[PDB]
Amino acid sequence: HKLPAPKEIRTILDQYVIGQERAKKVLAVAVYNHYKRLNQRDKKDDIELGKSNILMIGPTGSGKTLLAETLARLLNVPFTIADATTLTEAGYVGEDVENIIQKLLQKCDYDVEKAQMGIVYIDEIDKISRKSSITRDVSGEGVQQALLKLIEGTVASVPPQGGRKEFLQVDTRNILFICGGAFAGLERVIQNRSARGGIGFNAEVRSQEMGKKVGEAFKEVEPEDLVKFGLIPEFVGRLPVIATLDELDEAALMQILTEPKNALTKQYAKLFEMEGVDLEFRPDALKAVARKALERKTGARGLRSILEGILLDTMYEIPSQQDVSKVVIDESVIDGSSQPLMIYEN
């Protein structure tokens, strides 16, 4: 009866994420239908409850990881965020792939029943992609094969709580898995298969760089692309659902500055406020900063860097000073033409 409205979740996520549409929808739909699977898991001839593992392709600073924690805060079942580099197949020190389940168990108080009703977010999945075999890819291809069966759903003897200086079993049948990585190079892959011009008089000729497009190219991704990247065909299939995130936008960067609950601006304001200066900005000022981030091609992270440099001088002077009450920022300050202006009053 819970039935948390798809929009409710989407809007809760909209409080922090500012711009993603496909991602918030797919997950919210997934979350909306995941409860139903467990809610109606009784024997009404609906017993297979086939799961569809989600994927999150896209570039950096797209909020791939931000969603998982915010999702965790509105999730009543167990949830954990896992890393891929740490995991390796057995026979190497690494980290055992099944260990990912143990992490979830701890958070749910080793409630096996509850544990089988949790979600996971395996970040940096693009890292384990294989090359193109000569030697065992303990961290790449190997990891995929080990995780392969887990995604489909098998039973394992997750370690039991207690150092112990009975190897309880746990089934993966109804444990949804979501893998989101910052795949680098996939844009080129899709561009090549779609159109790869070749020298010739009667052969189509196209530029190596396809209209200098990065965003919106992920929407054309297909299973073959992932296989070229290095993902094992079997693994590509294990995750039926695929999603994509645009790179960025000028409007989206101006909104992220203030709109999000825990925006970067608030942190600086809070800090400056405790220093005794009223941190302030301007509308055009905020827009100017966004332009800089787009040139850095670093994503949302870029924003932070720009702010610090402009405010480095002020963050070094203001503390010693005990007069300034308000510090405003103008487009001229972002441009650098002027120096950070202050109001020596109080």
Add this chain to the structure above:
Amino acid sequence: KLPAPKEIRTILDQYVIGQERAKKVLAVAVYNHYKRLNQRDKKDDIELGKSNILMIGPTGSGKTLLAETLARLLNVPFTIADATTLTEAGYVGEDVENIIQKLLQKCDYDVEKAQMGIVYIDEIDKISRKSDNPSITRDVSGEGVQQALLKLIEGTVASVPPQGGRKHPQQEFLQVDTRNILFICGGAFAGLERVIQNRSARGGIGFNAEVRSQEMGKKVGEAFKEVEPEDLVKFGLIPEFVGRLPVIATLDELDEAALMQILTEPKNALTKQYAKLFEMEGVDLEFRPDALKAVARKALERKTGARGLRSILEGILLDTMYEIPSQQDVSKVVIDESVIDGSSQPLMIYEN
């Protein structure tokens, strides 16, 4: 009492659509196994050595589907394990007799009943030696597993651990002979298709050659039907291990007519499961005849076996599944072939 092969075959036909060859081989195996286990005493029979069968099918060919549905019909022990985690090279990790230990849980530590169990060690392509000639850093999850597993398939006593490992140093380790435990090893050999084609035509260069094309996906499911022991060794399987599995079954690829059936024919067919979920809130979900057929074409253009089917259905209804729950006053939502074409959107009746 032993059910006739045909019976088992038809039971599994209810879910599997097109694995006639595989369904027949397994049927004989279960049928002859029961007989052996039911006539295992001293009546003109000395050892009646078990015949271990192998399975090789493309992705999403139902290899996994068969074993669970098979398990539900079996009256003897049955366990599903994986070779990927097993890394027996006498260095670290699980051992090979722990796979039968899972079987003992089904048997409740019944030593005799364990000898009547069945095995499903799949994913035998993950242990295939990279080159078959170890040169540096002797494999841990490769050659080792093959060598270690060799003994069990041939048969040998097994020191399976008991329920716990703290009461006593030994806790009366159960002793279960393996010779009488039929092994059914089914793995998806990704790459065998090219290996077999190397033996079909040894494409050289010249007028009098047998030059082969660089793609063989059209005949990927047919490649398995031409498999031979020599091809398995090239892929990296120890020749000894190949011999321990005399029979080599094969699974074919899929068809546009077999995908349409799987969409609705099975008990928990994808379409049924989609409608089932859609029906919990109370909105009826229906699809036209041509609507379902459209999904089959897309499935064959993804080379993602039956799994691709599910994926396609997700994309077809994403925006509506987001709206439908909150969008009350929707008697039913019919689907058409246009919806799969991408021209029209889900037909929302939006009426009492």
